[PDB]
Amino acid sequence: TIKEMPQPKTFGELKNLPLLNTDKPVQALMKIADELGEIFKFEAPGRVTRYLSSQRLIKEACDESRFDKNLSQALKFARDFAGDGLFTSWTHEKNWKKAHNILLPSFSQQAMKGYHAMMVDIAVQLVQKWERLNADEYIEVPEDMTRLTLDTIGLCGFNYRFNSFYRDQPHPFIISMIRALDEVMNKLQRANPDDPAYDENKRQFQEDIKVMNDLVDKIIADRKASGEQSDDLLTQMLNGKDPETGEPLDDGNISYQIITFLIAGHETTSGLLSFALYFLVKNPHVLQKVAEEATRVLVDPVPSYKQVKQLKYVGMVLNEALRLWPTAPAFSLYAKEDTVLGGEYPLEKGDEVMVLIPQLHRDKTIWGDDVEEFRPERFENPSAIPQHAFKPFGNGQRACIGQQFALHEATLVLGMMLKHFDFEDHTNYELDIKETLTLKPEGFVVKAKSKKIPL
Numbered sequence: 001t002i003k004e005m006p007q008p009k010t011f012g013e014l015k016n017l018p019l020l021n022t023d024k025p026v027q028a029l030m031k032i033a034d035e036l037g038e039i040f041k042f043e044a045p046g047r048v049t050r051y052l053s054s055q056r057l058i059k060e061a062c063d064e065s066r067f068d069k070n071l072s073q074a075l076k077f078a079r080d081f082a083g084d085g086l087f088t089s090w091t092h093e094k095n096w097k098k099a100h101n102i103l104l105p106s107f108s109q110q111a112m113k114g115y116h117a118m119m120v121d122i123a124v125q126l127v128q129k130w131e132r133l134n135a136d137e138y139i140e141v142p143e144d145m146t147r148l149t150l151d152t153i154g155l156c157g158f159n160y161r162f163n164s165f166y167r168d169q170p171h172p173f174i175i176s177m178i179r180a181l182d183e184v185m186n187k188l189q190r191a192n193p194d195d196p197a198y199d200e201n202k203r204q205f206q207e208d209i210k211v212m213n214d215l216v217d218k219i220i221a222d223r224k225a226s227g228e229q230s231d232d233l234l235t236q237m238l239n240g241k242d243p244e245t246g247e248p249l250d251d252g253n254i255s256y257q258i259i260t261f262l263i264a265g266h267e268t269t270s271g272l273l274s275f276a277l278y279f280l281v282k283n284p285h286v287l288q289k290v291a292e293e294a295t296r297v298l299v300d301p302v303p304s305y306k307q308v309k310q311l312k313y314v315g316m317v318l319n320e321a322l323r324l325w326p327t328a329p330a331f332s333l334y335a336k337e338d339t340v341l342g343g344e345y346p347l348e349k350g351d352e353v354m355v356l357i358p359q360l361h362r363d364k365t366i367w368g369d370d371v372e373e374f375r376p377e378r379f380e381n382p383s384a385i386p387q388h389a390f391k392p393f394g395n396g397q398r399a400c401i402g403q404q405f406a407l408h409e410a411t412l413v414l415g416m417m418l419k420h421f422d423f424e425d426h427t428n429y430e431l432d433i434k435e436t437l438t439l440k441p442e443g444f445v446v447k448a449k450s451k452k453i454p455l
């Protein structure tokens, strides 16, 4: 029954590494997958992994009793500043489970209902900016989505105003974040990481990190002595004790969690909104249908928590977007013990598998032949979607803890955008996906014509 795993051109000791050599890795890995099937091996200096593309195999990979979350080289490098923060820590390290039980309660239907008003605050700013543009001006979508998602997480999770709508250029923190992330993704290429040439990178990496820290310092400083009568993420982060250890998160960790949530809590949500708006302008009828919904439901100056939850179709657009381009391209797992995958590929305790989510979301045995066609209607009956065929948010216990937070925000913002403006792809934008571990539409710009609706 055994069938051995294929793999791309060998290329000496550098391994399969040269098959990439690009700032658009994932997109290359997708092409490779189009050739080699549902699975292939990928090697590099001191590491090896198998890339999965089918729901058949990924369905097994998602078996928690057999495979656990693995820190891919990517997250390993990303850890140089994130540390044992929920996203970059191992499932077994005390810190993960500890922080998980302590922070999770900040994502209940309760905390969410509390966040809404704050989400609206920032949502109003974004609508306001656009309302105030002059005729000859246009909008830089990703840039503004980043101002939103970032300001939203800062307000809701730390009661700190980044005030990105009062800045001409990306807030200093963002400039450093995207550079640190870019550095990490590019480091997966570097054949010899300590060789002089990269002395600039190291010099600059410690710098960008300091920037992020300084930001944290100022946040863990602003809370220090103000109306601390608020109970948000940062609150239950300093006044939270693990119900099974009586031990709260120490200083070193609380730091990492903030830096963790500030990045994981906006960057990919920024991309979602960007791709969503991208697909809406390139698919007029779909945009129309959603516009119809946004207006029919959002009948007040500001959206109510209930009204957002009613934005069914808007929510479908968001999933269809995440399907084609999951802003978090992949997550990895390793075999907990020795086992056989799909009854054909033998694996050894420790071996790691890599989930190529974009490809997973294109398996024609799950979605059909029009996989590249943008159809929100696909999510009409969520119950019918096969188990583990749609995974924009990771898997199991190590799945996105911010999922509801993100989808509620994106739904709110997209619903309002659609309520207050008509959109125009005035340059017939050509989709250019920029990679920095995550995915976003580079240089996507549009013009927006107000429908002139109050607030």
Ligand code: HEM
Binding pocket: 069, 075, 086, 087, 100, 260, 261, 264, 265, 266, 268, 269, 272, 326, 327, 328, 330, 331, 332, 392, 393, 394, 395, 397, 398, 399, 400, 401, 402, 403, 405, 406, 407
């Ligand atoms: C649409 C936007 C988002 C996407 C697509 C996304 C994607 C993901 C994915 C795929 C994982 C799994 C990582 C892995 O297996 O290595 C994850 C984990 C995580 N996400 Fe999200 N995320 C989004 C928004 C958010 C938001 C808004 C927050 C913050 C409030 C957040 C916080 C986290 C954290 C803390 C983890 C670690 C969970 C754990 O292991 O306990 N994410 N996310």
Ligand SMILES: CCCCCCCCCCCCCCCC(=O)NCC(=O)O
Binding pocket: 025, 026, 044, 072, 073, 074, 078, 082, 085, 087, 088, 188, 259, 260, 261, 263, 264, 328, 329, 330, 331, 437, 438
């Ligand atoms: C709190 C910090 C959150 C940071 C978010 C990081 C984003 C998660 C997406 C991980 C994407 C990994 C993509 C790996 C693809 C790749 O380049 N493979 C080649 C290789 O690993 O050698």
